[PDB]
Design a protein around this ligand. Structure first.
Ligand SMILES: *[C@@H]1O[C@H](CO)[C@@H](O[C@@H]2O[C@H](CO)[C@@H](O[C@@H]3O[C@H](CO)[C@@H](O)[C@H](O[C@H]4O[C@H](CO)[C@@H](O)[C@H](O)[C@@H]4O[C@H]4O[C@H](CO)[C@@H](O)[C@H](O)[C@@H]4O)[C@@H]3O)[C@H](O)[C@H]2NC(C)=O)[C@H](O)[C@H]1NC(C)=O
Ligand SMILES: *[C@@H]1O[C@H](CO)[C@@H](O[C@@H]2O[C@H](CO)[C@@H](O[C@H]3O[C@H](CO)[C@@H](O)[C@H](O[C@@H]4O[C@H](CO)[C@@H](O)[C@H](O)[C@@H]4O[C@H]4O[C@H](CO)[C@@H](O)[C@H](O)[C@@H]4O)[C@@H]3O)[C@H](O)[C@H]2NC(C)=O)[C@H](O)[C@H]1NC(C)=O
Ligand SMILES: CC(=O)O[C@@]12CO[C@@H]1C[C@H](O)[C@@]1(C)C(=O)[C@H](O)C3=C(C)[C@@H](OC(=O)[C@H](O)[C@@H](NC(=O)c4ccccc4)c4ccccc4)C[C@@](O)([C@@H](OC(=O)c4ccccc4)[C@H]21)C3(C)C
Ligand SMILES: *[C@@H]1O[C@H](CO)[C@@H](O[C@@H]2O[C@H](CO)[C@@H](O[C@@H]3O[C@H](CO)[C@@H](O)[C@H](O)[C@H]3NC(C)=O)[C@H](O)[C@H]2NC(C)=O)[C@H](O)[C@H]1NC(C)=O
Ligand SMILES: *[C@@H]1O[C@H](CO)[C@@H](O[C@@H]2O[C@H](CO)[C@@H](O[C@H]3O[C@H](CO)[C@@H](O)[C@H](O)[C@@H]3O)[C@H](O)[C@H]2NC(C)=O)[C@H](O)[C@H]1NC(C)=O
Ligand SMILES: *[C@@H]1O[C@H](CO)[C@@H](O[C@@H]2O[C@H](CO)[C@@H](O)[C@H](O)[C@H]2NC(C)=O)[C@H](O)[C@H]1NC(C)=O
Ligand SMILES: OC[C@H]1O[C@@H](O[C@@H]2[C@H](O)[C@@H](O)O[C@H](CO)[C@H]2O)[C@@H](O)[C@@H](O)[C@@H]1O
Ligand SMILES: *[C@@H]1O[C@H](CO)[C@@H](O)[C@H](O)[C@H]1NC(C)=O
Ligand SMILES: *[C@@H]1O[C@H](CO)[C@@H](O)[C@H](O)[C@H]1NC(C)=O
Ligand SMILES: *[C@@H]1O[C@H](CO)[C@@H](O)[C@H](O)[C@H]1NC(C)=O
Ligand SMILES: *[C@@H]1O[C@H](CO)[C@@H](O)[C@H](O)[C@H]1NC(C)=O
Ligand SMILES: *[C@@H]1O[C@H](CO)[C@@H](O)[C@H](O)[C@H]1NC(C)=O
Ligand SMILES: *[C@@H]1O[C@H](CO)[C@@H](O)[C@H](O)[C@H]1NC(C)=O
Ligand SMILES: OC[C@H]1O[C@H](O)[C@@H](O)[C@@H](O)[C@@H]1O
Ligand SMILES: OC[C@H]1O[C@H](O)[C@@H](O)[C@@H](O)[C@@H]1O
Ligand SMILES: OC[C@H]1O[C@H](O)[C@@H](O)[C@@H](O)[C@@H]1O
Ligand SMILES: OC[C@H]1O[C@H](O)[C@@H](O)[C@@H](O)[C@@H]1O
Ligand SMILES: OC[C@H]1O[C@H](O)[C@@H](O)[C@@H](O)[C@@H]1O
Ligand SMILES: O=C[C@H](O)[C@@H](O)[C@H](O)CO
Ligand SMILES: O=C[C@H](O)[C@@H](O)[C@H](O)CO
Lengths: 757, 355
């Protein structure tokens, strides 16, 4: 706590709102200060106490990195994983904007969204990595900025999560005290032990971006960092976040992420959630306890006034005073925890379904194609896998958090992951419907085996009978994972391994579609010539089928690319990705430093199956005419809020986020079909124990016709070219050679040049 | 420095390793510390049971001429004596016979044979007779065969003493009896040995011992280049566990363990004798190792490797499905241990004429 709590001032865009915040907070009794800084019972994931005297209502904090969870009358958007794979900033913004309208219109003040770099992707087994975007700071940065902007532009305050170094579900050990059993007496949360350079270059990057975009709040994570709870880590919250990043908004505890009263109050927490929610089982360390701590001199009224001011800035800035959200009408907690009836509100707007479809079509990523795609007009179509049709119990059968179905239930198409970042669907467009519609248009026949191939009587016989005559066999695989657990391995879910064994036995034209929360093991089949094409569709939300089939039939070429590294073996990744121990105080030393996902692979000379940034088209693109234009620079005036990140070249007037040069290139459609192409730029920044190369830009050209060219253009910010000096505690542009590379993936870089300041 | 290479079961112990890993995987931190540290009982040393997984206490018993402090057994000739036969057949049959007597008395681990420590730098070595030849080649041969004899008989061996343990004078085992402590009084003689000599002379017999399938090795009382053998990382983690690819457990000599954390990090797998001998010989793990794990100082997986190395021998020599009989003699002695003795006659026709 040699890291003092810095006072809010409202920074750049919130000056007005901050002033109304302080005015209102200054009139508050000690009891009112405590009411608003701690959760109360209500319909939403969390609810701040009202300040009824001053006309401040309860604020509805609601889960939703894909939109409002636990509500009917809404849309199931694709997961962050899925937008990442588009590499399309437009879709990134519009997804968040759409999510925003549904949040606001269901009546949410604070969206517990988005996921902006925690987890980032240290382990590919992370049960909830899918809620994020890329396993890359730069790209996670850009998507984080845009997701924040879209939500706030809808008039919903964001709680970007989870700060910070939250990189495994195992032993996250949220605080809970129910059934005579406290977590304090079993095991502390895993301790991300992160060096200083790593924390700046890797984990903080995307949070800087969420701050700059004007994230109103930030959620502190369940893990300890260097053996201190994140939610009471002064160097984490008071210094790195509230000083260096100059964060002006509130820190909200994850649910059970607050472990004590006074260090939390002292070391950076602003809001205690869920308080009296969830039977108080997840800890209730403030409220009346904070009242007494203020009255008896232990915690200063000033410290708590700042908490209240940070809460209330968002409220005023997004105009929730003069333009209040409508009432929230759905019990999203669930009996018997909360026994309360639900209302009904329909919030689905024209346009949303089609936007969800588009994200699907722009994301689906072609990994293998020996010639079978696109489809022409096959007459006999076979389909394998329960993933191809509905959950047999209904699309929302697995409950409020998409996690309550039996371990062996055929859940249908995996349109989202499990846990707090899930949401209900009004319907699912199954791959099998969309395929059938097209088959019918072609006067074709189509048949699917959707049962459990290993335990259903007749299923293997039915498969053996159907495939040999099929012109093409589609196989739908999936791999559910959830918050609360890490995947044990890359195993396909359900009967996936079986389905693939059977299909390569009885068919020479197998097209595989994988709906997944993460990398899976296909080493047994991927080099088999009977598998003619492999696609991964990630988590496409309610428009799973109608997004996919247009790409299969060549109505639009696939343009999606991989937002992480597809290794052949889990053993190829960063070691000790998930630590398993019963040790009271579990440790995870991030000794790999900045070298996660593809930086690991690159530095260690390991070849993946499919690299970060890989994804095939139905055409090819040739790269030419790399230009580095040092005269193309711009002052940063565009951000919503500013950080206070120190840097060696601060002249008093300039910024870390100034664009200092712009690089260009030409792609040419060098094949026989129209296609969209994601161009990528990587920089090798000189220094010791540094990454081989780092993504610093991407530009997606849309619908480039055969023969045509287009210029691709990459703004380079000072930060994009900087390192963290541990000694000097600021950012600086190093001396030496900067290799700048451009092309179609992290391994396919035809254009290179050296810059040397 | 020199990191701890994980056990994988090697050539012959492949299936035993895998049963060991499986069992260890189920073990709590308490269970891990129970088995990696000596408890009280009738044998020279005893590993704590993992009683919830039905792993029992292992009886570790002296010594290199046969089970010591038992009635109903035979007194075999010393290693020195077989060496002089220059007869490989006799060297093997000696060990095989010692082996049946160890097994039939109920010993899981024989604190034998002596495989090149001491080897014979001095002809005055008080315990030189327990070894064989003053020659790496011949000692290697006898050691190979001595190990094979005992293991063929169904008893895990603990070859001793690793390494450069060439004088009894001022070995200075760790003892904290009365008020006084050896650690205050005088450190063990430090054998300071160049790298050629270590390779070509002292390691040679132990290489043979490893190749023969010695299940465990006992680290010696002396220090090597001023570090205790039982916490010498170069010696245990690099020379033994990496270069000689040793897949088994390193047992402390009795008071050869001087510390908690370096020992855990630098190659030791079993703390002996632990609670035995009134705790007088050091008791650095047990409850201390539980604490060190639970507070993040020592990795649980580091200690799981130790327990795996211990169980590998258990499963390989089939002590799980064919357990040795109960050990029945108090070999510690009153008043240190106040336990009554049974009786078992283990002498078999043929043994007297072999001797
Ligand atoms: C007790 O103290 C004694 C006395 O000091 C110790 O004896 C020393 O032991 C070390 C080994 O631990 C030994 O180290 C070498 O010296 C050589 C030159 O004399 C070096 O060439 C050699 O280096 C290579 O090995 C290292 C280890 O693998 C590598 O890191 C290094 O890169 C070198 O290897 C590369 O090059 C060669 C080709 O030249 C190639 O074959 C390799 O594969 C590789 O590419 C050692 O560093 C000292 O020389 C020893 N000194 C004496 C006087 O003997 C003894 O180790 C101590 N005992 C204990 C138990 O601690
Ligand atoms: C988790 O644990 C890790 C592991 O320790 C920890 O990592 C360390 O972070 C600290 C920062 O808290 C690093 O700090 C220092 O060592 C430098 C030498 O390597 C030293 O020069 C640094 O200096 C100064 O900065 C402080 C902070 O502003 C200042 O008070 C001092 O006066 C020094 O700066 C002055 O001189 C500079 C020029 O010399 C000048 O530029 C500056 O403006 C000022 O006038 C610093 O103390 C430490 O090196 C890290 N070690 C590792 C292993 O990386 C993480 O920080 C922990 N994370 C959490 C969340 O707790
Ligand atoms: C433990 C926990 O995470 O609780 C919360 C409630 O707010 C937390 C935030 C969390 O994101 C949320 C809402 C979720 O959406 C999760 O997806 C979620 C979970 C992860 C799940 O929790 C677990 O699986 C816990 O690991 C699990 N842990 C334990 O059982 C445990 C108990 C004592 C000591 C150590 C551990 C648990 C299950 C059921 C009730 C309480 C705890 C409970 C929970 O019902 C959901 O919890 C409840 O609905 C609930 C919890 C306590 C009392 C009453 C209801 C869960 C769901 C919705 C299924
Ligand atoms: C600390 O927080 C508590 C939880 O928010 C406060 O209590 C709630 O205050 C709300 C007013 O701000 C009440 O809402 C209204 O409910 C009554 C029904 O009894 C209706 O008549 C009103 O129209 C309705 N207003 C709306 C929603 O339009 C809550 O009823 C009340 N809840 C509880 C648990 O009693 C405390 O007031 C607050 N304390 C302080 C000092 O501010
Ligand atoms: C269909 O969706 C189901 C969720 O609604 C899913 O069930 C859950 O599967 C996960 C595996 O990711 C299991 O994970 C847990 O398993 C045990 C629980 O005792 C723990 O040891 C693990 O650490 C891990 O947390 C869930 O237990 C399981 N949930 C339930 C309620 O059974 C199915 O797997 C999905 N179906 C298919 C075919 O994938
Ligand atoms: C840790 O090891 C000790 C030493 O053996 C254990 O206790 C003995 O358990 C056996 C059965 O395995 C009983 O027959 C003895 O009565 C016990 N002896 C004593 C001194 O009480 C102990 O059970 C082990 N603990 C765990 C958790 O496995
Ligand atoms: O108890 C052992 C007997 O030791 C005899 O002496 C030895 C010599 O003095 C010399 O070689 O040192 C060793 C110790 O390093 C001594 O043990 C003598 O002291 C007798 O009293 C003992 O019986
Ligand atoms: C102040 O009140 C808190 C909460 O009741 C309590 O923990 C603490 O003991 C009190 N301290 C003093 C100095 O009275
Ligand atoms: C809700 O109803 C259930 C079932 O009657 C009851 O057991 C439970 O205690 C109630 N919940 C609360 C928090 O009042
Ligand atoms: C490919 O499919 C045919 C049936 O169409 C099958 O007979 C053959 O064995 C398969 N080959 C491979 C490599 O699986
Ligand atoms: C952990 O426990 C050991 C032994 O109980 C003690 O010596 C050590 O200092 C402890 N360390 C911490 C960080 O608590
Ligand atoms: C992290 O390093 C410390 C020593 O600096 C050690 O105590 C801890 O066990 C380490 N964690 C690992 C790598 O298991
Ligand atoms: C054994 O008995 C003796 C004498 O009866 C007693 O002094 C001694 O303490 C006992 N030993 C132990 C270890 O209890
Ligand atoms: O110990 C139960 C364990 O089962 C899963 O496989 C793991 O990935 C953990 O996430 C979980 O806690
Ligand atoms: O069994 C697979 C996986 O399951 C879960 C945990 O118990 C892990 O220890 C283990 O790796
Ligand atoms: O970055 C300079 C210096 O900072 C600190 C540590 O992480 C060192 O290992 C590193 O070399
Ligand atoms: O010593 C403190 C600090 O000094 C400097 C760097 O070399 C860091 O690695 C180191 O941690
Ligand atoms: O043989 C094992 C034996 O040792 C212990 C005793 O408490 C008995 O309960 C058990 O049968
Ligand atoms: C549960 C999750 O940890 C948390 O992110 C949610 O936002 C609270 O429901
Ligand atoms: C005493 C000896 O040092 C030792 O070799 C025995 O094996 C333990 O009794």
């Amino acid at each position: 706590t040699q890291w003092p709590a810095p006072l809010a001032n409202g920074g750049k865009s919130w000056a007005s709102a901050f002033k109304k915040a302080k005015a209102t907070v200054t009139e508050m009794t000690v009891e009112e200060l405590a009411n608003i800084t701690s959760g109360v019972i209500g319909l939403c994931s969390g609810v701040t106490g009202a300040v009824t005297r001053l006309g401040i209502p309860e604020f509805c904090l609601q889960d939703g990195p894909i939109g409002p969870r636990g509500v009917h009358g809404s849309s199931q958007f694709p997961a962050g994983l899925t937008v990442a794979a588009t590499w399309d900033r437009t879709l990134m913004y519009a997804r968040a904007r759409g999510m925003g309208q549904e949040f606001h219109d269901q009546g949410v003040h604070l969206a517990l969204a988005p996921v902006t770099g925690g987890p980032l992707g240290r382990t590919p087994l992370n049960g909830r990595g899918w809620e994020g975007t890329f396993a890359d700071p730069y790209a996670c940065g850009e998507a984080s900025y845009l997701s924040v902007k879209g939500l706030t532009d809808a008039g919903v305050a964001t709680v970007s999560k989870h700060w910070i170094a939250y990189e495994q579900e195992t032993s996250r050990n949220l605080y809970i005290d129910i059934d005579g059993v406290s977590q304090a007496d079993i095991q502390l949360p895993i301790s991300s032990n992160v060096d200083d350079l790593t924390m700046h270059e890797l984990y903080m990057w995307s949070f800087a971006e969420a701050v700059r975009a004007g994230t109103n709040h930030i959620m502190c994570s369940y893990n300890r960092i260097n053996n201190t709870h994140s939610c009471s880590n002064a160097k984490g919250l008071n210094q790195l976040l509230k000083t260096e990043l100059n964060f002006q908004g509130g820190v909200v505890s994850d649910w059970g992420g607050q472990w004590d009263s006074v260090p939390a109050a002292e070391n950076g927490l602003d809001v205690a959630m869920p308080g009296k929610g969830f039977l108080g089982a997840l800890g209730d360390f403030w409220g009346a306890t904070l009242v007494e701590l203020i009255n008896n001199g232990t915690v200063s009224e000033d410290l708590v006034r700042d908490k209240a001011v940070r809460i209330l800035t968002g409220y005023y800035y997004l105009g929730q005073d003069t333009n209040p959200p409508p009432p929230f009408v759905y019990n999203t907690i669930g009996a018997p925890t909360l026994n309360a009836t639900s209302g009904y509100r329909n919030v689905r707007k024209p346009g949303t379904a089609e936007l969800i479809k588009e994200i699907g079509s722009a994301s689906v990523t072609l990994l293998k194609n020996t010639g079978s795609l696109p489809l022409k007009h096959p007459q006999r179509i076979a389909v394998l896998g329960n993933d191809a049709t509905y959950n047999v119990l209904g699309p929302n059968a697995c409950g409020l958090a998409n996690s309550a179905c039996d371990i062996d239930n055929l859940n249908g198409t995996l349109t989202t992951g499990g846990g707090s970042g899930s949401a209900l669907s009004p319907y699912t467009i199954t791959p099998l419907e969309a395929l059938q519609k097209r088959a019918i248009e072609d006067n074709a026949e189509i048949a699917a085996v959707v049962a459990n191939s290993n335990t259903t009587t007749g299923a293997e016989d039915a498969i053996a009978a159907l495939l040999p005559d099929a012109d093409v066999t589609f196989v739908f695989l999936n791999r559910y994972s959830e918050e609360g657990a890490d995947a044990p391995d890359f195993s396909l879910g359900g009967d996936g391994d079986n389905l693939m064994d059977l299909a390569v036995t009885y068919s020479s034209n197998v097209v595989v579609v994988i709906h997944t929360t993460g990398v899976v093991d296909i080493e047994k089949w991927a080099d088999n010539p009977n598998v003619t094409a492999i696609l991964v569709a990630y988590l496409p939300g309610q428009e799973a089928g109608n997004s996919l089939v247009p790409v299969l039939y060549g109505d639009v070429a696939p343009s999606g690319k991989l937002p992480w590294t597809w290794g052949k073996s889990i053993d190829d990744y960063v070691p000790n990705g998930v630590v398993y121990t019963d040790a009271y105080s579990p440790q995870s030393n991030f000794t790999e430093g900045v070298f996660i996902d593809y930086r690991w692979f690159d530095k260690m000379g390991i070849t993946p199956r499919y690299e970060f940034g890989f994804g095939l088209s139905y055409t090819t693109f040739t790269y030419s005419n790399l230009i580095v234009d040092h005269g193309r620079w711009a002052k940063d005036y565009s951000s919503v809020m500013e950080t206070a990140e120190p840097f060696a070249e601060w002249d008093g007037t300039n910024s870390l986020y100034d664009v200092i040069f712009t690089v260009f290139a030409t792609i040419t459609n060098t094949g026989n079909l129209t296609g969209s192409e994601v161009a990528q730029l990587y920089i090798s920044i000189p220094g010791d124990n540094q990454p081989v190369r780092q993504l610093r830009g991407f530009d997606k050209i849309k619908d480039l016709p055969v023969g045509d060219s287009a210029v691709v253009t990459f703004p380079i910010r000072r930060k994009d070219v900087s390192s963290w000096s541990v000694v000097d505690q600021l950012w600086y542009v190093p001396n030496g050679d900067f290799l700048i590379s451009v092309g179609g993936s992290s391994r396919d870089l035809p254009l290179n040049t050296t810059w040397t300041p």
